[model samples]
Target chain A: SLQTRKQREDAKREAWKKERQEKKALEAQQDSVSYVQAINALKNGSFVLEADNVVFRNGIMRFVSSNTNYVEVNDGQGIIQTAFTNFVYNGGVTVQGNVNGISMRQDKDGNVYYNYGINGIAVSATVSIVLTGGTNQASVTINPNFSGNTLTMNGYLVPYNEGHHH
Target chain B: EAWKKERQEKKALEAQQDSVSYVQAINALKNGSFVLEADNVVFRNGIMRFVSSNTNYVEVNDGQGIIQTAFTNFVYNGVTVQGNVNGISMRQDKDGNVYYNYGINGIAVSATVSIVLTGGTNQASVTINPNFSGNTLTMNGYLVPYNEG
Candidate 1:
């Protein structure tokens, strides 16, 4: 009887898994979306509605995701699938939220290149540098030097040297 | 004829005075020197000056010490050899050898010279122009206001 009970419990777990898969499939089909194709597209595919530009001077800034449960949370560059929890990768871009918000440097090429809405003071979980090209051309370049609230933000205005004297 | 003779005599007397004086002093000032002190002083009428040849120096003994005038005593004092009148004559001798009027009246107030030192501690200061919170040294460095607890 005990053996039978154990088998039934296993069966129940499998059934639940199947049901969840079916439901997700139905939803994907409804939206005419395929999980694989959605994976390769990195530029502005499905991103978050950020808090915009929240300013907190001489105070603390916090960040959290509205869709925390649904986001792909991966460690480094395992090709993030879930959005929530992850490890430190290639000093990868981690969108980690704590009891407080993860200080983030919202904009690249900014003097205050990093903001303190992330875990560390003035350090960001996400960092990026937009190049001359489009968003796809932009890279998620993270700087580990951002020492919490002590993060150093440095960006030099384009000098006349590189043909951009305008 | 008598008047002409007197005039020629006056010219010779003047010609003899056109030379350097022989007094030696601790300070040859351009403007200030106390004659009664026998330091052979010169003043620019009201200004004082000093220029000494001795490597040693004489303090601005007294009286405004040194005046804005380049010479020690002001020419107001006659003892000053050539007096400031020599200032304009532009050094001329019948022989063309550069002559020096050593009298207090001439440029170099007297013969001797000196170097003066005067000032206070607060007069000079050392400051960390900018005690920036930025710089950290190889040795112990201070933070915002103090050190580690």
Candidate 2:
């Protein structure tokens, strides 16, 4: 009887985990994109994008051309990475035009998404930049997803600094 | 007690009316349209413009408005105002009550009384709470870029 009880508890955990995992799996699957495909669509230049008050700082950013592709952004101290999968024509998050400037939209959750299309690749990112009281201090959180891929990043951004430089 | 309560309700209603009235006034101005009398300038696209200049500015007080305010610089209608610590300041009148008008830039903005963030362990939600003295005003939104066209 105790064994049966234990098994029931185990089954509950399994089912719970299974439900969450299934949702994440579907999300991850649908939001996949190609690194090269996404990058090929983008304009090659230093782009400063902001969404919902977060800034994706201008650093030496380069997108790799591959199935397991990514965009690397450097902020002098280190690098923040964003990975991509296979990209669809237009779905989930799409960057439309070749506007060097940024256009933004907010989802149901009040989270803002900034979209910009380079050559052809569209980069959609969400980040938060907090300006504390004094001194050039800010914590930047940028979550950019293009095609089916999302780039993740977190670091200090120069709140008032003009562009990324040494 | 009954009389005081009635008075409070009436004051609140009046404040709410004033708040709506200001919205209507600013909306009427649209963007890029400047009101010489009110010193209110609507942006080129109509909506995202700066607060009125001169006397109509938000007041600095307790719940009547912001107690303290500041910004580095504010540029609107091509007019620029630099600040010290709290920078440029003004009072907000919902009707009988007032809120503070803080700073400016493109996509014109406001400075709230205070903002609070709360959530579970890894999850966080932001809430801007500004309690007023018999005022019917509330803060419930953040800024984001819109087409404005």
Candidate 3:
């Protein structure tokens, strides 16, 4: 009987410890995240991409393209590392029209991480841009007429179907 | 002996009435002394004091009415001075006995007592304790944000 009592007490203590750990971890996670700040930075250019398609899932980032090609950004350069926290998309795609339903993150450092992957999915056509003399235009070009598979992003959130919101 | 007992009782009742009347006057009126209809109030010549009829309140006439006597004690209401009062200065006599100085409304160099308001919109606000202590000025245990005038 004493042995059983000891076991139950130990088990209860262990459970409490686990719960406390989980609670602290959740608090830390919340503190680490700044959805508004991250979203603001991404929109501002701390996280910019001239890619065609991107997907966000788990913690990986993938940019999709048929051929190995690079995309242009507003910065003319690219994003820095350490500025991003973490993210992941499905696959690699290309650059084209306005992208929606994308998520991005940034760290305290100067790195930006895109959770949007270049995953090739069902998408409507987009006007392609050709680069000449280090110049390319239109990332997420607001095509009010983009009818089919298009992306839309809200602060750290992506609605699967948005362009359809007529 | 019976008349003597009756007189003592009458005196005690009058004293009680005086205290209660002051409280009532403040409740029903504002900014001045509501002379107790009592035959007379004996004072030590220099004890000039007014009864505080706390019932007289300044409400949020949409919010503003604060008299020092009502310090942080007003809720959603406003004030309209019905009488004169001197500056409410806290002073001490030569013997170091502290007293509250009264000023009349617009007594030369005295600022006109006008209703001034600050917080609280549509709520049970500005709570004062009955004992005039332990302020639970909370809507539900939280401090009330009152708009005082």
Candidate 4:
């Protein structure tokens, strides 16, 4: 009788573990679907990477004003806007240009990478974006041809229209 | 010719006066007694929506300090605190950037605070980093002598 009771308990534990595994698999599948949707938005040139933090070349990090700082790609055009303080003056800078030569790739780990070039008056920079799979987190780095410093922004990617307010 | 010379002299006189005021401000900062009257407060969450300078400020007098923060707490979408400062140390880097390291005893918690004031003029952009929370607040305003403020 004791052996039979122990065997029953073991069977119940196994079933519980199996159910948890199944639930985890289902969640992973949903995450994969959301990741694919974000990738599609990027490929279609309608996405906004809203930065919460900006890192300067000097390693000084600053928090960004969400409404004022963002990188947007809409209809093959790109806009890079940010506010910065040099201690002497605080101001906002915006660069709008055409985005072209778009290319993208994905890793085996589900992380996506996008490489593109933006051209406008006094603005010519190559932008690289890396999207970590399942997390919706994005890291964007801009390398302007005229400057030796690279500007980086860390944030989340959302659909352009849904993320914008004006 | 006379009018041109007179205009040039006036411009030179204005420049000299501006330089004098800037130097005075720098000296005041070096004297380690001042107040930063902030017109805008930028929170760590990237929300700089609303702030009033009359109510938000940080002051340091003879190694003692105080931080008064009054704004729409964009992070929590509410209000926040005022604090008393202690054990303050002020220094200036080779680049003339002034830094104030102190401790603040607020209503909720005691926090270590670091205020970085950049630029030599009276106008400065100050960043306040407190240890109680990851949220850092920045103030854009003037750093005036304690007596004048």
Best by lDDT: 4
| lDDT by residue (tens digit), candidate 2, B18-130 | 45544543332232111212112111111111122342222222222221112212211122222221332333333212222332221233333211111111111111112
| TM-score of every model versus the real structure | 0.14, 0.20, 0.20, 0.46
Q: Which stretch of 10 consecutive residues in model 1 chain A shows the poorest summed lDDT? A: A52-61
For DockQ, the strongest prediction is 4
> Candidate 1: lDDT of A157?
12
Q: Give me the overall lDDT of model 4.
A: 0.66
Q: Positional deviation of A16 in candidate 1, in angstroms?
A: 56
- The 10-residue segment of model 3 chain B with minimum total lDDT is B39-48
The backbone clash count of each candidate, in order, is: 67, 36, 65, 0
Model 4: TM-score, first chain: 0.74
Model 4 DockQ class: incorrect
Instruction: Compute the DockQ of candidate 1.
Output: 0.00
Deviation (Å) of A144 in candidate 4:
5.7
For candidate 3, the per-residue lDDT at A146 reads 49
Q: What is the lDDT of residue B117 in candidate 2?
A: 11
lDDT (Cα atoms) of all candidates against the true structure: 0.23, 0.27, 0.28, 0.66
lDDT tens digits by residue: candidate 1, B96-135: 2221222112254422121110011000000010112221
Better of 2 and 4 by TM-score: 4
lDDT of 1 by residue, A27-94 (tens): 64643332222222222122221111111111111121222211221221111111212222102233
For model 2 the local lDDT of residue A13 reads 99
